[PDB]
């Protein structure tokens, strides 16, 4: 699934009051049980990157964001191999779990999807 898909569907849910009332609390619990924050990751660090689109989005990250992501990946790899969890400031607090990458990938995909559409245009 494309990030675009996930973002659009999420926006449909967040619009509907009923839907958000039942989905948002579930999503927050899901995230708590997921436990990626306990390895000091941000959600966006987990997104599959071995794709042309994602490689382009990562190249467009600001250098600071890019350097910090490299560190979080290396740090999490060290926790993984040691069978430890993050403690203290290494734990990602909910307020630090920012979607730093989502804007970049949404722009990359916007162009890619428009290109596919326009490759199929029919002069009327």
């Amino acid at each position: 699934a494309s990030i675009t898909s996930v973002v659009k569907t999420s926006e449909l849910i967040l619009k509907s009051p009923l839907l958000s009332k039942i989905v948002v609390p579930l999503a927050k619990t899901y995230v708590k049980f997921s436990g990626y924050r306990q390895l000091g990751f941000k959600m966006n660090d987990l997104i599959i990157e071995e794709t042309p689109n994602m490689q382009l989005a990562l190249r467009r990250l600001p250098p600071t964001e890019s350097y910090d992501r490299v560190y979080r990946l290396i740090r999490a790899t060290q926790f993984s191999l040691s069978h430890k969890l993050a403690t203290g400031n290494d734990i990602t607090k909910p307020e630090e779990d920012d979607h730093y990458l989502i804007p970049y990938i949404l722009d990359v995909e916007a162009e890619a999807f428009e290109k596919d559409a326009l490759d199929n245009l029919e002069v009327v």
Binding site: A1, K28, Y30, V31, I48, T77, Q78, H99
Partner: protein, 383 residues
């Protein structure tokens, strides 16, 4: 420049076993690949040795296996090693496939090593099936009979193909001699495909338990994974030892110590344990051709995992719902295994059908739904 890099031949070995850059966080489930290579080497050594003492002619086959047991120096060991390692080969291959499914090893960019992997699995099944026939005991003969008759389901030409495979009108000497020749060949074919799936993997490298890139943090294959592989090699050899020396017949069927008799049918004709889930799936469909299709589809459906998994994240480490679904899928696969060896009786008939539906609905319904929902939960949950 170091010789290991300069010389083209040495460099190929170097690229796979020494300088090969690995993730630094592979867990013990990444050790089944080398255990599978170990099983393959043991099977080649013991298999070629048994071939020096075995006679493929139906008048002598069963007796040649007894001669191996009784007269050949350490023949008992070589025979039991070969027979038990066939079981261990399947334990390791199921573990390896289990690892791959849990950690999303089938996702891009590793679709090709996974798809070649599915073929390796089919080749192992055929290899092991043909090897079992070679003993020419009661289970050998009757197993061959019923499995080869599944080909009769192919429309129009089905029966003709069966007689072609047998080289006669029933399983007999021609079938045994051809199964010997093909059993000898198939492990070499299998080794080639095993090499192909590694070469295909080398473009992306190994995945890792976190499902993120390891390009940031690599370790040489040697010495780290060399020495880590030794632990599981010795754990494997301990398990091997307990079966081969202390309980060599635990995984076998007593009926295979009775010489093949085309007249007498054994009480229950069951495949070897590792084929039992596929046999349960076949029984579930009442139609002959239906059953065969289902049974083959149960393996070929693995090829669609890259498509039906809709997750933006690789693997299950961080996906609580996917982990629960995976648990149910694996346990259902074991229940299918058990149901493959019960009698066709109430209430196991309907149970087998329910378990078969669950097996397929994992690929076709549940994984696509669950992976879609988890995508949304990750996004909303972290806003």
């Amino acid at each position: 420049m170091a010789l290991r890099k300069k010389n083209s031949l040495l460099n190929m070995a170097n690229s796979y076993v020494l300088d090969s850059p690995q993730p630094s966080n592979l867990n013990y489930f990444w050790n089944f690949g080398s255990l599978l290579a170990l099983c393959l080497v043991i099977q080649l050594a013991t298999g070629i040795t048994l071939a020096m003492h075995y006679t493929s002619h139906a008048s002598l086959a069963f007796d040649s296996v007894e001669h191996i047991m009784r007269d050949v120096n350490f023949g008992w060991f070589i025979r039991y090693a070969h027979a038990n390692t066939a079981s261990f080969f399947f334990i390791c291959i199921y573990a390896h496939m289990g690892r791959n499914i849990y950690y999303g090893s089938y996702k891009t960019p590793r679709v090709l090593p996974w798809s070649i992997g599915v073929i390796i699995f089919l080749l192992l099944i055929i290899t092991a099936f043909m090897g079992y026939v070679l003993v020419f005991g009661q289970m050998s003969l009757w197993g061959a009979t019923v499995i080869c008759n599944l080909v009769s389901a192919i429309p129009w030409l089905g029966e003709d193909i069966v007689h072609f495979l047998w080289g006669g009108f029933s399983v007999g000497n021609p079938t045994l001699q051809r199964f010997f020749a093909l059993h000898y060949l198939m492990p070499f074919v299998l080794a080639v495909f095993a090499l192909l799936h590694l070469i295909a993997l080398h473009t992306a490298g190994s995945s890792n338990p976190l499902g993120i890139t390891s390009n940031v943090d690599k370790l040489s294959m040697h010495p780290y994974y060399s020495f880590k592989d030794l632990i599981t090699v010795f754990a494997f050899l301990l398990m091997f030892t307990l079966f081969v020396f202390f309980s060599p017949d635990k995984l076998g069927h007593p009926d295979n110590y009775i010489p093949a008799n085309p007249m007498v049918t054994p009480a229950s004709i069951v495949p070897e344990w590792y084929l039992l889930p596929f046999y349960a799936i076949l029984r579930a469909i009442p139609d002959k051709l239906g059953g065969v299709i289902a049974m083959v589809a149960a393996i070929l459906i693995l090829l669609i995992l890259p498509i039906v998994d809709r997750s933006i994240i690789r693997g299950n480490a961080f996906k609580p719902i996917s982990k629960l679904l995976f648990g149910f899928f694996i346990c259902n696969f074991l229940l299918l295994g058990v149901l493959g060896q019960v009698h066709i009786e109430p209430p196991f008939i309907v149970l087998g059908q329910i378990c078969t539906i669950f097996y397929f609905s994992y690929f076709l319904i549940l994984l696509p739904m669950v992976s879609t929902i988890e995508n949304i939960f990750f996004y909303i949950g972290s806003l």
